């Protein structure tokens, strides 16, 4: 039969609907990838000894 049911809803229409769903999924995946590509780097934070070193106590 090659479709087991229907004539207008045969393998042609099934392949068309599958291609439409695949295009929608690929568009969603591309949007997700473009949204996730914005991540530059895991910029953490820590102490700032560069200023306090010169600002450390002294004879003054």
């Amino acid at each position: 039969d090659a479709a087991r049911i229907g004539a207008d809803a045969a393998q042609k229409q099934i392949q068309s609907l599958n291609k439409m769903c695949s295009n929608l999924l690929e568009k969603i995946s591309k949007e997700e990838r473009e949204s996730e590509s914005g991540g530059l780097r895991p910029n953490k934070q820590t102490f700032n000894p560069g200023d306090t070193n010169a600002l450390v106590a002294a004879v003054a």
């Binding site: 820590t46 102490f47 000894p49 070193n53 600002l55 106590a57 004879v59």
Partner: protein, 180 residues
């Protein structure tokens, strides 16, 4: 005869846990403790033009402990990649005897400062964290201080490499160096 290898340390005021837990864990001691004391610098140099500092650091939270004083200055140019310190000479004192002798021999109080923080130790090294305040005698720069210091005879500067390695061990938190 004796010498010292005191290294300067300055950490951000907010970064406290990454220092206390690391020092308590890496290698300091068992059962750490804290302290509290105030320093009184002095100077008596009329014509010599060399004011000698006499830090009569008295621990206010101590039960009559001696006013352990230390003389430090004139950093020796060893260029041994060490903390670039000079010779040290400790000197104990009695109750109110530091001020008494400073008045007898004649001295001038250059300034007064107080310190407070946690205490730590090592084998032949010593690291201390404390905060300095700016207040009257009855009672801050918002910057803690890691007092990684070594005091020992001259020897052959063997403790310099050990102190450098210990500082590199605590590199993710602080970065010790020398001073001018």
């Amino acid at each position: 005869n004796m010498m010292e290898y005191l290294l300067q340390g300055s950490v951000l005021d907010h970064s406290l846990e990454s220092l206390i837990h690391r020092l308590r864990g890496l290698c300091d001691n068992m059962e750490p403790e804290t302290f509290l004391d105030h320093e009184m610098v002095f100077l008596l140099k009329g014509q010599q033009a060399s004011p000698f500092v006499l830090r009569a650091r008295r621990s206010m939270d101590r039960a009559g402990a001696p006013w352990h004083l230390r003389y430090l200055g004139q950093p020796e140019m060893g260029d041994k990649n060490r903390h670039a310190l000079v010779r040290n000479c400790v000197d104990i004192a009695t109750s109110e005897n530091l001020t008494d002798f400073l008045m007898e021999m004649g001295f001038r109080m250059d300034h007064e400062f107080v310190a407070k923080g946690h205490l730590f130790r090592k084998g032949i090294m010593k690291v201390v964290v404390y905060k300095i305040f700016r207040i009257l005698v009855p009672g801050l720069s918002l910057s803690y201080l890691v007092e990684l210091s070594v005091v020992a005879p001259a020897g052959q500067d063997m403790v310099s490499d050990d102190m450098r390695n210990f500082a590199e061990q605590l590199k993710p938190l602080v970065h010790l160096e020398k001073i001018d």
